[PDB]
Coordinates of N, CA and C in Angstrom, one line a residue:
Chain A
X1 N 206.7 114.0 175.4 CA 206.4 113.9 174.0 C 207.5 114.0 173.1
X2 N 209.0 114.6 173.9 CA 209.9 115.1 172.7 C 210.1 113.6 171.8
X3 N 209.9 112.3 172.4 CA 210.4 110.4 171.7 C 209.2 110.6 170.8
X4 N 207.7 110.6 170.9 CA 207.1 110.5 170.5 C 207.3 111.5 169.0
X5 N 207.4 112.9 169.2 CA 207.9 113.5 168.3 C 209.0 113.3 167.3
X6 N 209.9 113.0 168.3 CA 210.6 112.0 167.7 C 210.9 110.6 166.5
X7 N 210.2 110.1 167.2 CA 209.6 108.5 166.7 C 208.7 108.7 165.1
X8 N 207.7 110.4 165.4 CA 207.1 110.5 164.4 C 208.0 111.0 163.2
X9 N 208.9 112.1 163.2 CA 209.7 112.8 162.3 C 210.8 111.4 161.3
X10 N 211.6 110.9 162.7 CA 212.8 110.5 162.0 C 212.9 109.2 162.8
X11 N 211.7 108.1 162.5 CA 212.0 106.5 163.1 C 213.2 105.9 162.8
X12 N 213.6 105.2 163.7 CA 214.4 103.9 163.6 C 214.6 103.3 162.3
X13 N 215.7 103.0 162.0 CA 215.7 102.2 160.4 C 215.3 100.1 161.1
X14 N 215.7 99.4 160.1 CA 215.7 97.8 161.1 C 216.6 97.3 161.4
X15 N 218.2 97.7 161.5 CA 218.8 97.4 162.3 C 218.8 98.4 163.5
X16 N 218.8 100.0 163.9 CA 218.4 100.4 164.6 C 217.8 100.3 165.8
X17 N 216.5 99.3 165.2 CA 215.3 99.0 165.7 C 215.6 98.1 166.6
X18 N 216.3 97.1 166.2 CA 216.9 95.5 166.3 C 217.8 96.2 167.9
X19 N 218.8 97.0 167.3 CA 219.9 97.2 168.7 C 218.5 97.9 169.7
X20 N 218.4 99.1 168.9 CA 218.3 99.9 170.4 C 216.7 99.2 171.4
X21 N 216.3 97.9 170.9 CA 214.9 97.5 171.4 C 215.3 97.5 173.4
X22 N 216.4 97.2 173.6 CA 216.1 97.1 175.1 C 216.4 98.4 176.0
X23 N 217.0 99.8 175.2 CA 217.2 100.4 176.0 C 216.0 101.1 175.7
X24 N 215.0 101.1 175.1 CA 213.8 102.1 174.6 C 213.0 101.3 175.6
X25 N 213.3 99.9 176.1 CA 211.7 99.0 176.8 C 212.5 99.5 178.6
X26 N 213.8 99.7 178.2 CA 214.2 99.7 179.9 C 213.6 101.4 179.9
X27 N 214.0 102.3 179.4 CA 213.1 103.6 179.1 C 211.8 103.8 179.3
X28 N 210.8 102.6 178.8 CA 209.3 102.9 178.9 C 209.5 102.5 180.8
X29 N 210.0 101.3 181.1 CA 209.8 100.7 182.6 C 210.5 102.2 183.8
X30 N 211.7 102.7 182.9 CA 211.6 103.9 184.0 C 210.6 105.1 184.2
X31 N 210.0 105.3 182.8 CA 209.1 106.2 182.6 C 207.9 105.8 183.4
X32 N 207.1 104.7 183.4 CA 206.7 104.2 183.9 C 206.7 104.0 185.6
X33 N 207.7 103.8 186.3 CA 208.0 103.6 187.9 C 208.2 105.6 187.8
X34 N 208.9 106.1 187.2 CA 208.6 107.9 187.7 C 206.6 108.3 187.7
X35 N 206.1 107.5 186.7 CA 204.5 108.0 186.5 C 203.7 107.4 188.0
X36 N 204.3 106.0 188.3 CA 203.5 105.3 189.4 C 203.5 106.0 190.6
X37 N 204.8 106.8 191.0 CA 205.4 107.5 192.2 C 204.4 109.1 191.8
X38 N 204.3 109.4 190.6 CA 203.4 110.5 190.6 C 202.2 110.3 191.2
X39 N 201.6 109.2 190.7 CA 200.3 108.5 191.2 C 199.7 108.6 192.3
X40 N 201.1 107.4 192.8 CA 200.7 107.5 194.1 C 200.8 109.0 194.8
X41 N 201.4 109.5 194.7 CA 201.6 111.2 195.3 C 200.2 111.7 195.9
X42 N 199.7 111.5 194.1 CA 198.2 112.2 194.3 C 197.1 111.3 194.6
X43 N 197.3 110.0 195.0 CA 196.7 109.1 196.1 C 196.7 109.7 197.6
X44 N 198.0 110.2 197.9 CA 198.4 110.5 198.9 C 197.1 111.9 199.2
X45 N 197.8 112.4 198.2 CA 196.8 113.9 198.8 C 195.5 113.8 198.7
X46 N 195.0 112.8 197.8 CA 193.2 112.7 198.1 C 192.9 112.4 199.9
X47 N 193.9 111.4 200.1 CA 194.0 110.5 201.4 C 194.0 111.8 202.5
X48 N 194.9 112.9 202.8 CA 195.0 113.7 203.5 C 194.3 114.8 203.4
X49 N 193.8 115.1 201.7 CA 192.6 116.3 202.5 C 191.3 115.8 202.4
X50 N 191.1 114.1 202.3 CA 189.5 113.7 202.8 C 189.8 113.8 204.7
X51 N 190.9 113.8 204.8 CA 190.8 113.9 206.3 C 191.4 115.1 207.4
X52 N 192.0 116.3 206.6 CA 192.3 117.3 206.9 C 192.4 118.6 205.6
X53 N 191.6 119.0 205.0 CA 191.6 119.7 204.1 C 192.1 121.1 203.9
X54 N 193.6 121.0 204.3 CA 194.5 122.4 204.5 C 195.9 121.7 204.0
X55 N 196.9 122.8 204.1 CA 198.1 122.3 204.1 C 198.9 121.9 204.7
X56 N 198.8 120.6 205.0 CA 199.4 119.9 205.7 C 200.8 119.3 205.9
X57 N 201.1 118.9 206.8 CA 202.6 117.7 206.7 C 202.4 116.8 205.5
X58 N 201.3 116.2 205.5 CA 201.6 115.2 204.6 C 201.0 115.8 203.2
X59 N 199.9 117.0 203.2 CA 199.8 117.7 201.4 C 201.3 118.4 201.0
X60 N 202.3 118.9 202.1 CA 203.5 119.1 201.5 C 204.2 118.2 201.5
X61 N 204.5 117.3 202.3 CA 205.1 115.6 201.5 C 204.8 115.2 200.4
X62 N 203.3 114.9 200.2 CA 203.1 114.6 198.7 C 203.4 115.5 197.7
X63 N 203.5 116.6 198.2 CA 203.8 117.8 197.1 C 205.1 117.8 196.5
X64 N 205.9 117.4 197.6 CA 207.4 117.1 197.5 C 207.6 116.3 196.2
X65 N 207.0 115.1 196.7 CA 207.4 114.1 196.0 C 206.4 114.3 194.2
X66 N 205.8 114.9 194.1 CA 204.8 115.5 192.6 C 205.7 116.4 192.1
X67 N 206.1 116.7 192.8 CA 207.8 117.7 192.4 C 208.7 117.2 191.4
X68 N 209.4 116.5 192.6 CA 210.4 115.3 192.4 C 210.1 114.5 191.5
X69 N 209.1 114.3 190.8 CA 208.9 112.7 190.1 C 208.5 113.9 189.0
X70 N 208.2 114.9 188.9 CA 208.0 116.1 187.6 C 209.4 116.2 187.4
X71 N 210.0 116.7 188.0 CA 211.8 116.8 187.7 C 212.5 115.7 187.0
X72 N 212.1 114.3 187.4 CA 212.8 113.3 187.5 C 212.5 112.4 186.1
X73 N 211.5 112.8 185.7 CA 211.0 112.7 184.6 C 211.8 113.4 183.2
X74 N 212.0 114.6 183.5 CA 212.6 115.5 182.1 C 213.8 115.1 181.9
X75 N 214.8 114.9 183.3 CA 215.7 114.3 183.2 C 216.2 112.8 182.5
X76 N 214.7 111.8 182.9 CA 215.1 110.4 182.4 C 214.8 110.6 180.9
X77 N 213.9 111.6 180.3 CA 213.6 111.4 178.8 C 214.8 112.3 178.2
X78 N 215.4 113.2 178.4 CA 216.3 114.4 178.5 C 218.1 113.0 177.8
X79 N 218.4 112.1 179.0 CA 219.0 111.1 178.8 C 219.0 110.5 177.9
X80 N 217.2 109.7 177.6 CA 217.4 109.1 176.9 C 217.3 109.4 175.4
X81 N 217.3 110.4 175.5 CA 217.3 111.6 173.6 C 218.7 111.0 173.2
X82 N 219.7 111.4 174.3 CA 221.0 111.3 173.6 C 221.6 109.4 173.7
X83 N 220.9 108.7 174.6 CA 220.8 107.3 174.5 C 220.9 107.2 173.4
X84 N 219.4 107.3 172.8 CA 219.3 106.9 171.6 C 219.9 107.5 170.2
X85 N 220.7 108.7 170.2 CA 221.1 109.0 169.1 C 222.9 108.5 169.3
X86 N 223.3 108.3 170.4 CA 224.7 107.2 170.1 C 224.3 105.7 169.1
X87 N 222.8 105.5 169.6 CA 222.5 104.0 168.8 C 222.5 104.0 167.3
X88 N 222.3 105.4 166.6 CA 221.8 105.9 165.4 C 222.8 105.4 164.4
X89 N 222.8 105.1 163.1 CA 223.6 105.4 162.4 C 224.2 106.9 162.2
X90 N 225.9 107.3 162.1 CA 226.3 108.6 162.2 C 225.1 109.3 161.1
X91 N 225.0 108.6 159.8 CA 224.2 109.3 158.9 C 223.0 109.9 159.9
X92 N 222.6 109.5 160.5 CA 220.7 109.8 160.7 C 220.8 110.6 161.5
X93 N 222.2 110.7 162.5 CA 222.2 112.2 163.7 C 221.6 113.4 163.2
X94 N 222.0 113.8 162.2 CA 222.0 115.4 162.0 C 220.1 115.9 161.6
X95 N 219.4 114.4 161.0 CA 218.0 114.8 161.0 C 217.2 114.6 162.4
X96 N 217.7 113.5 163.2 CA 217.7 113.4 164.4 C 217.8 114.6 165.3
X97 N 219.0 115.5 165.3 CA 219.3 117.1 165.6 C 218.6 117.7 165.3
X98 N 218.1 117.9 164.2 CA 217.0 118.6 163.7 C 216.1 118.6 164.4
X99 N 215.8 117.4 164.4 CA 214.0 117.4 165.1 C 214.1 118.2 166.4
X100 N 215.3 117.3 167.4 CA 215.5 117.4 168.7 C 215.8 119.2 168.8
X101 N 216.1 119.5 168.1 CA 216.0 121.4 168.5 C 215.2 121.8 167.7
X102 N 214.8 121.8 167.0 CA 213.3 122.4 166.5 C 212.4 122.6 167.6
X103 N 212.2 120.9 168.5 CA 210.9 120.4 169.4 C 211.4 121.6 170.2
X104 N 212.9 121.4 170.7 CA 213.4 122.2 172.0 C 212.7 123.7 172.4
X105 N 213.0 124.3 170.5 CA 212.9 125.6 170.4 C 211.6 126.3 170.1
X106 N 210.7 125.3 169.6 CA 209.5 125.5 170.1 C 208.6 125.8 171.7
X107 N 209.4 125.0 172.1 CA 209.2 125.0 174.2 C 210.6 126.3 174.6
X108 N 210.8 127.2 173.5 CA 211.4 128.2 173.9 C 210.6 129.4 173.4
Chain B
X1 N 195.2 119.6 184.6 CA 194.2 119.4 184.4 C 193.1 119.4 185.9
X2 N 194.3 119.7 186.6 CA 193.6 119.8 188.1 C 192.1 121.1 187.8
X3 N 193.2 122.4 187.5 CA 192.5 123.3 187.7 C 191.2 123.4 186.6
X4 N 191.6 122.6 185.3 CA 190.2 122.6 184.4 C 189.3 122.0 185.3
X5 N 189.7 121.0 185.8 CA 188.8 119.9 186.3 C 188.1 120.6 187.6
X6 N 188.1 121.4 188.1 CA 187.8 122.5 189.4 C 187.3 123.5 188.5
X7 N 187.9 123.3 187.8 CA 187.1 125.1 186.7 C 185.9 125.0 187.1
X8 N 185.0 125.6 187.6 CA 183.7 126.1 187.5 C 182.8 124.4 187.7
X9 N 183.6 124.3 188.5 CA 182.9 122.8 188.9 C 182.0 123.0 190.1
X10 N 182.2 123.6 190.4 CA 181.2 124.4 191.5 C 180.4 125.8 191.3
X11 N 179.2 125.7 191.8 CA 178.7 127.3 192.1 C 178.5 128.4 192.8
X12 N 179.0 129.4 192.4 CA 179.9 131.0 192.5 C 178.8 131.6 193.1
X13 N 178.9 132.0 194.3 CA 177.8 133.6 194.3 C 178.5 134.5 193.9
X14 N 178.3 135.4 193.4 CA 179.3 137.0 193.0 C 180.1 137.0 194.0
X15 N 180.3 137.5 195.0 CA 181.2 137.6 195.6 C 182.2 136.8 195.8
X16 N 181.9 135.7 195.5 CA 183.1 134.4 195.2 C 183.5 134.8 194.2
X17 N 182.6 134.9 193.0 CA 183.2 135.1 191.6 C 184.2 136.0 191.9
X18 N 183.6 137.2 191.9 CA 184.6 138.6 192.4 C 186.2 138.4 192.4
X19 N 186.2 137.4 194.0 CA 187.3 136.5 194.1 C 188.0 136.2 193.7
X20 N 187.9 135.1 193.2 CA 188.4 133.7 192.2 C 189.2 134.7 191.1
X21 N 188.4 135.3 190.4 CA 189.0 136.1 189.4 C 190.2 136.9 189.8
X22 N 190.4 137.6 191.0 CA 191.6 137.9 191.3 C 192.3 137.2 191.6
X23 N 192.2 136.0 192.4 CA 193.0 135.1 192.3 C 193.7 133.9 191.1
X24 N 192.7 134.2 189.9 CA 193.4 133.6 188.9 C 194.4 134.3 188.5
X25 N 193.9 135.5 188.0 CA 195.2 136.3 187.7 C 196.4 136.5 188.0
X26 N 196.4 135.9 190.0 CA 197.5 136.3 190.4 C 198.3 134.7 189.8
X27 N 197.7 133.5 189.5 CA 197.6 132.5 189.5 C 198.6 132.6 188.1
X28 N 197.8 133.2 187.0 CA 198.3 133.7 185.6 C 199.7 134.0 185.6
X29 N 200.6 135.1 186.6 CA 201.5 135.9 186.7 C 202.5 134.7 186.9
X30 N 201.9 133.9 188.3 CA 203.3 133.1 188.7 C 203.3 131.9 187.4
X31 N 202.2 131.6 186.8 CA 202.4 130.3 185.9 C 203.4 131.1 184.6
X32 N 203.2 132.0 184.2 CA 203.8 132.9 183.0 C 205.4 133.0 183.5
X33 N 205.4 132.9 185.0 CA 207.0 133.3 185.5 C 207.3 132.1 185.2
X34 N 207.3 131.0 185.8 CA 207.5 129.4 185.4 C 207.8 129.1 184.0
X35 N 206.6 129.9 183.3 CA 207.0 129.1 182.1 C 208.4 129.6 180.7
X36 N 208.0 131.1 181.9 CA 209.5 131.9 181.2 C 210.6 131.2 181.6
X37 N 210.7 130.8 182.7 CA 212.0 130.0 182.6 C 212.3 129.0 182.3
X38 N 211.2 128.4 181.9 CA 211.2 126.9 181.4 C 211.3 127.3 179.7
X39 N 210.9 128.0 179.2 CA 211.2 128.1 178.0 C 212.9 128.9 177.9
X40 N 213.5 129.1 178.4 CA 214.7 129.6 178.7 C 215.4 128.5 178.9
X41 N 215.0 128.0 179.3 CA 215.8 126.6 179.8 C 216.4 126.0 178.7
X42 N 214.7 125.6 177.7 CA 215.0 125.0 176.7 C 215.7 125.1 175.6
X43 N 215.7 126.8 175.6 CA 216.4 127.7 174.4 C 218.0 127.4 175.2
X44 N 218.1 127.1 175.8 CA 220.0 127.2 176.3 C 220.3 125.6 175.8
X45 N 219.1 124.5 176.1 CA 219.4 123.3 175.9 C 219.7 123.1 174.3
X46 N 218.6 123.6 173.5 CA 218.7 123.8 171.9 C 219.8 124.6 171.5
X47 N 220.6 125.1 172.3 CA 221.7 126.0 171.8 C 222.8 125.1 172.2
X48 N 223.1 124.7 173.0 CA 223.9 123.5 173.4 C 224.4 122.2 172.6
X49 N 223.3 122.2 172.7 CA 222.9 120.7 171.5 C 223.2 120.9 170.1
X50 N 222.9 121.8 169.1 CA 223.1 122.6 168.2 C 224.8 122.9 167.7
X51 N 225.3 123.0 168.8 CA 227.2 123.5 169.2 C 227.5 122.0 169.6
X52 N 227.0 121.3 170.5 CA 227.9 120.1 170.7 C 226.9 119.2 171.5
X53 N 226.0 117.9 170.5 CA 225.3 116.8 170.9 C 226.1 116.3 171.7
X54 N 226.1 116.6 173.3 CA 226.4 115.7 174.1 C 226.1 116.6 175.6
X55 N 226.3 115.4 176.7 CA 225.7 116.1 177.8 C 227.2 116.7 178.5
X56 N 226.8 118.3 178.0 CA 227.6 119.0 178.8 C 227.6 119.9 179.8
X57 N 228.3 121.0 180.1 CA 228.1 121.7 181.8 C 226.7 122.2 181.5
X58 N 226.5 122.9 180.5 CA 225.5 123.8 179.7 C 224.0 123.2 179.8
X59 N 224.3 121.5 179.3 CA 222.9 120.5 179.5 C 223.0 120.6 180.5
X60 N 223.5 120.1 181.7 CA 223.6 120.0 182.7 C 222.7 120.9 183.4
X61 N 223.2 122.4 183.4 CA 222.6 123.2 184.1 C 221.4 123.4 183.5
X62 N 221.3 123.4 182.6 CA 220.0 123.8 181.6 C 218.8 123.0 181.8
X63 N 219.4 121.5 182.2 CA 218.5 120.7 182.6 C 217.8 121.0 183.6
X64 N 218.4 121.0 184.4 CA 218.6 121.7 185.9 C 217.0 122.4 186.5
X65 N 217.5 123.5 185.3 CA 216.4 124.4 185.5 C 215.1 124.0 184.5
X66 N 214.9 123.2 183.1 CA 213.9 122.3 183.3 C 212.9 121.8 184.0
X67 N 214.0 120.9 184.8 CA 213.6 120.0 186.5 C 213.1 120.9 187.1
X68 N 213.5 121.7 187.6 CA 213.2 123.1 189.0 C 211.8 123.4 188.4
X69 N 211.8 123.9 186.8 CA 210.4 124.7 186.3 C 209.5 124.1 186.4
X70 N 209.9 122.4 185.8 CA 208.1 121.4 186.2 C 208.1 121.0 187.6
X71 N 208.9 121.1 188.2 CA 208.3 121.0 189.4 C 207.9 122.1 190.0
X72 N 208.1 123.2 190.2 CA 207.4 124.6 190.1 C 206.1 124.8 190.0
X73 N 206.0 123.7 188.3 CA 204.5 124.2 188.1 C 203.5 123.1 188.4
X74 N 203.9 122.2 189.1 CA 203.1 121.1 189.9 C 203.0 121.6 191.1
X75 N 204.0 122.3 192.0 CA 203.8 122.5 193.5 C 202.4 124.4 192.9
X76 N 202.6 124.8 192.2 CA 202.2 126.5 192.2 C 200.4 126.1 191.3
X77 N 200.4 124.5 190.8 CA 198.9 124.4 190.8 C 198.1 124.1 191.6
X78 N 198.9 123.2 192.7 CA 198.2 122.6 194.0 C 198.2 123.9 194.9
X79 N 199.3 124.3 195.3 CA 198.2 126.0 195.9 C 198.1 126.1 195.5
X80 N 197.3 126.9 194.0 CA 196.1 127.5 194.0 C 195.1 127.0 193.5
X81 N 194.5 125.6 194.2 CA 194.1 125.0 194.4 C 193.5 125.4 195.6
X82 N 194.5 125.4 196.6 CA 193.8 125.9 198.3 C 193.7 127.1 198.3
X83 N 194.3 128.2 197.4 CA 194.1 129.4 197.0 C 192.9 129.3 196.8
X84 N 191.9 129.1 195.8 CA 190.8 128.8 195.0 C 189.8 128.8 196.2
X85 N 190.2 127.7 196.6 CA 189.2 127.2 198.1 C 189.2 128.1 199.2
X86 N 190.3 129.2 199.0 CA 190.3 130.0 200.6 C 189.1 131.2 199.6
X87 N 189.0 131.3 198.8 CA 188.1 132.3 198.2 C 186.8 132.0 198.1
X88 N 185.9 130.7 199.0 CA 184.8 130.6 199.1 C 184.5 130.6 200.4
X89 N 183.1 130.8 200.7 CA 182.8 131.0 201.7 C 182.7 129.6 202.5
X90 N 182.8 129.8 203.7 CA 182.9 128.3 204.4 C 182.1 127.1 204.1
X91 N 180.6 127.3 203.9 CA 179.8 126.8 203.9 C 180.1 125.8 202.1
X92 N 180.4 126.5 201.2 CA 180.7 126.3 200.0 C 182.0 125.3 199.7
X93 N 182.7 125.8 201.2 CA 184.2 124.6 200.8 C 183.7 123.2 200.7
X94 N 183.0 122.6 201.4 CA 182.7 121.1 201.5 C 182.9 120.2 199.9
X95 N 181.5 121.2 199.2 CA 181.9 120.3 198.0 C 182.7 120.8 196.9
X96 N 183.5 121.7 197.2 CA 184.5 121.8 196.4 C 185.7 121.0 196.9
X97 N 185.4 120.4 198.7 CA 186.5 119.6 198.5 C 186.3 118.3 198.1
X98 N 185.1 117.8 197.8 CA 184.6 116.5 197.5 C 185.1 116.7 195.7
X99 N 184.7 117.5 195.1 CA 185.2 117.2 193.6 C 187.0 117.1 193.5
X100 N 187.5 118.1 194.5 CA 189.3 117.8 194.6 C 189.5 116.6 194.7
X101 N 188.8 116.3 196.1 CA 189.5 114.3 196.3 C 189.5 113.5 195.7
X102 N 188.1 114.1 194.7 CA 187.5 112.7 193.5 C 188.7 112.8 192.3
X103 N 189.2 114.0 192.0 CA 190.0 114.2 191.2 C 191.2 113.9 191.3
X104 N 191.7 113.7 192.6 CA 193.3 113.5 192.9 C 193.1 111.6 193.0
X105 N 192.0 111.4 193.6 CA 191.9 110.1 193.5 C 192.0 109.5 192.1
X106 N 191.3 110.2 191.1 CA 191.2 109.2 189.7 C 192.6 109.4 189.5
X107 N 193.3 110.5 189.4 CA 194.5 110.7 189.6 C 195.4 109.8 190.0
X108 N 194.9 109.1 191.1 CA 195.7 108.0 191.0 C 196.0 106.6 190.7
X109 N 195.1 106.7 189.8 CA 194.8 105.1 189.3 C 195.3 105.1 187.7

């Protein structure tokens, strides 16, 4: 939610909008393939404890990977905070900062 | 949303109750450990960022542990999930594992 927070506080002006359109749609498509791999994860574990309901080889494999796609996540939106604030005009960084530690320091 | 969704989705004789209730607590302890360091995390990230908007050793590690915390708190809901379940009586596991499957299933669509 930190883009969304984001997006609400201190949007894009229209040239902004104009540049940064394909690294925010390549952003949703990563966000996106990390959410599917979560998905599937917990596909996985319905699948193994309809047919062994303990912890298993494969409930810790899927666990693994529910992990991994939680981690991999903070990281890809984490990235793309500062993506998008090289795209910014210099003017707009410092309300941009703002937001982006306020949100931080809240989740502290 | 696992655990709301299992919240009291099934019914407790006392002695289960009894149960469950110590086991949330214990459940409480380790999610409060998680989330301390996940909020630590973030406080080092907001201190970083604040001194110098860019990804440095500081992001780096800070991230780090971010990553480590949510994943932490995805593996420490699914056990106690089977935690939950080791606290009913045998007879009672069945449909509490029928509301899990149904839940990890919608889960994944």
């Amino acid at each position: 939610d930190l883009h969304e927070i984001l997006h609400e506080a201190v949007p894009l002006d229209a040239n902004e909008r104009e540049i940064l359109e394909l690294k925010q749609d390549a952003f949703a498509q990563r966000r996106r393939e990390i959410e599917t791999r979560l998905r599937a994860a917990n596909g996985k574990l319905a699948d193994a404890i309809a047919k062994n309901p303990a912890w298993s080889p494969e409930v810790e494999a899927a666990t693994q990977e529910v992990e991994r796609a939680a981690g991999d996540l903070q990281r890809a939106t984490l990235v793309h905070v500062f993506e998008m604030r090289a795209g910014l005009k210099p003017e707009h960084r410092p309300a941009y900062d703002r937001v982006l530690i306020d949100a931080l320091r809240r989740g502290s």
